[PDB]
Design a binder for this molecule. Structure first.
Ligand SMILES: *[C@@H]1O[C@H](CO)[C@@H](O)[C@H](O)[C@H]1NC(C)=O
Ligand SMILES: [Co+2]
Ligand SMILES: [Co+2]
Length: 434
């Protein structure tokens, strides 16, 4: 797709700290850009939509190539249309924003320049950030994570994509998403099937795969840390059901691990660690600091800070595993006790280490779940299971919670705020910011 300018594109600025082993941190200046799927896609020489509702223009987009040639992505009014705002080192994303039309959430990427994404090499370093999830009820997911995307959004590999990172192209994750309207410089109209429960989305014949490090997926009820390896580390297109993931006719069999080795304190047994109010170790009605360290062994460590008090990830005992470090033993024990073989089939932490050793793009989003109502994060899932089933309960939310239309109608003002991002060598982000 190309880029049009009927609507100007001004990326909300966002600063962050780059810390060094020497003990000091220096401020960096970047910005955020919204993913291409949220944009208006229209004809290059007119205002005629190439995509509207959940279907494509049969005339402008008869096939993927013709569609990309005839269509362009336009600018985004971040605050008025998407409910996205920033202030210094803080970023806020509203849930439902009403303008001429209704918008739900957003997916944003941190940029290095107005035309390139900021790449981070996680291995050997740690990532710290503050978050306010107080306004996130059951069914919502305020997420901060990393994916192995190209810094240019795919332009160098696919010249038919001239919009690039400036317009949020090139997304990919461990679900090998097929809902993307443009992949590899081509539209995804071929094989497109409108969503049965979402008037704005659909699934196409192509998907976009790549490694995914879900540092933070949570709401005021539950939170999870989850590495997702793929046999091909970076962004790579996939065909139909062979894509795997939630969309496909079979979530497995693809090149990526859609499940991942997840660590949810509640799911592991400590139901008093994270929640709303003073009855929990971490009070989700108040802002908290989340630090994630990627040691060179490939294992992941985590600690939290709230009101000046530090808490390491709570210990968990599963099978023969005992500890609070997300390592090979934990992941293998999880599969043995909770079931599944996706994470290990895709190479586990050894394969994932290939992703963190390379560059990954920072993603921050807010979304509700049109496939599983976010029950996998904050409720009992599958819903027919009980606490007697290992790992079935992940949160205190009712198994009836999270219906998109309902939470969108009831909690339109929900929101998430990410702030004070700090990145640097392990043990360095706690020092004074620049
Ligand atoms: C949960 O984790 C916190 C922090 O590690 C700990 O202080 C508390 O005792 C744990 N509670 C339970 C029930 O495991
Ligand atoms: Co194809
Ligand atoms: Co970890």
């Amino acid at each position: 797709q190309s880029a049009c300018t009927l609507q100007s594109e001004t990326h909300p600025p966002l600063t962050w700290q780059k810390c060094s082993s020497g003990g000091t941190c220096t401020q960096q200046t970047g910005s955020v850009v919204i993913d291409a799927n949220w944009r208006w896609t229209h004809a290059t020489n007119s205002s005629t939509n190439c995509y509207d509702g959940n279907t494509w223009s049969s005339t402008l987009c008869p096939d993927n190539e013709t569609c990309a040639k005839n269509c362009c992505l336009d600018g985004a009014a971040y605050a008025s249309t998407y409910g996205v705002t920033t202030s210094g080192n803080s970023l806020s994303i509203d849930f439902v924003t009403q303008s001429a039309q209704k918008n739900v959430g957003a997916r944003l990427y941190l940029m290095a320049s107005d035309t390139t994404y900021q790449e981070f090499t996680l291995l050997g370093n740690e990532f710290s950030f503050d978050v306010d999830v107080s306004q996130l009820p059951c069914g919502l997911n305020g997420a901060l994570y990393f994916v192995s995307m190209d810094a240019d959004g795919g332009v160098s590999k696919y010249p038919t994509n001239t919009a690039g990172a400036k317009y949020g192209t090139g997304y990919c994750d461990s679900q090998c998403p097929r809902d993307l309207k443009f992949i590899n410089g081509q539209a995804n109209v071929e094989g497109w099937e409108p969503s049965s429960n979402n008037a704005n989305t659909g699934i196409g014949g192509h998907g976009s795969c790549c490694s995914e490090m879900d540092i933070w997926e949570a709401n005021s009820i539950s939170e999870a840390l989850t590495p997702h390896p793929c046999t091909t580390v970076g962004q790579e297109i996939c065909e139909g059901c062979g894509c795997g993931g939630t969309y496909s006719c079979n979530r497995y069999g693809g090149t990526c691990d859609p499940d991942g080795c997840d660590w949810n304190p509640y799911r592991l047994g400590n139901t008093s660690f994270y929640g709303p109010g003073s009855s929990f170790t971490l009070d989700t009605t108040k802002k908290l600091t989340v630090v994630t360290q990627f040691e060179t062994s490939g294992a992941i460590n985590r600690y939290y800070v709230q009101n000046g008090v530090t808490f390491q990830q709570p210990n968990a005992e599963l099978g023969s595993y005992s500890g609070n470090e997300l390592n090979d033993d934990y992941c293998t024990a999880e599969e043995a006790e909770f079931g599944g073989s996706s994470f290990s089939d895709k190479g586990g932490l050894t394969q994932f280490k290939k992703a963190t050793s390379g560059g990954m793009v920072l993603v921050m989003s807010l979304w509700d779940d049109y496939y599983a109502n976010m029950l996998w994060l904050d409720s009992t899932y599958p819903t027919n299971e009980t606490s007697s089933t290992p790992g079935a309960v992940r949160g205190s939310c009712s198994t009836s919670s999270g219906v998109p239309a309902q939470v969108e109608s009831q909690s339109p003002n929900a929101k998430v705020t990410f702030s004070n991002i700090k990145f640097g060598p392990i043990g360095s982000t706690g020092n004074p910011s620049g």
